[PDB]
Amino acid sequence: SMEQVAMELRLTELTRLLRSVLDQLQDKDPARIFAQPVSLKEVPDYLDHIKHPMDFATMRKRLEAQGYKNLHEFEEDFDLIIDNCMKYNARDTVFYRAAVRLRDQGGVVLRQARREVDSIG
């Protein structure tokens, strides 16, 4: 149907806007702390602690399969990156501190992304 095509074009355009958002958020992690999944070879107990692991590479895989239907779903995954780190790592660690700084800086990007998603529809 033409309606299905129109919906697919909206998804494609959302995916374009989320790729730009994802790039901007990942620039706020210059140490690349959140770039890849936590390795279960290197942290073998991780899944006893963290039930839903997340990282920027995993988000990018979902994104490129057009797997985020709305900004809420994308934000859920971003929040998992931050929140998982703040639980696993103590306050006095470079990891925890990196997550706080990513959260704070990312808030700005996400605030305007929300306005753009609503505005363009």
UniProtKB/Swiss-Prot annotation:
Numbered residues of crosslink Glycyl lysine isopeptide (Lys-Gly) (interchain with G-Cter in SUMO2): 41
Organs and tissues of expression: Highly expressed in testis.
Superkingdom in the source lineage: Eukaryota
Residue ranges constituting the Bromo domain according to the UniProt record: 9-113
Subcellular location: Nucleus; Chromosome
Subunit structure comment from the entry: Component of some HBO1 complex composed of KAT7/HBO1, MEAF6, ING4 and BRD1/BRPF2. Component of the MOZ/MORF complex composed at least of ING5, KAT6A, KAT6B, MEAF6 and one of BRPF1, BRD1/BRPF2 and BRPF3. Interacts (via PHD-type zinc finger domain) with unmodified histone H3. Interacts (via PWWP domain) with dimethylated and trimethylated 'Lys-79' on histone H3.
Protein function: Scaffold subunit of various histone acetyltransferase (HAT) complexes, such as the MOZ/MORF and HBO1 complexes, that acts as a regulator of hematopoiesis. Plays a key role in HBO1 complex by directing KAT7/HBO1 specificity towards histone H3 'Lys-14' acetylation (H3K14ac), thereby promoting erythroid differentiation.
UniProt protein name: Bromodomain-containing protein 1
Lineage summary: Eukaryota, Metazoa, Chordata, Craniata, Vertebrata
Primary gene name: BRD1
First and last residues shown, out of full length: 555 to 674 of 1058
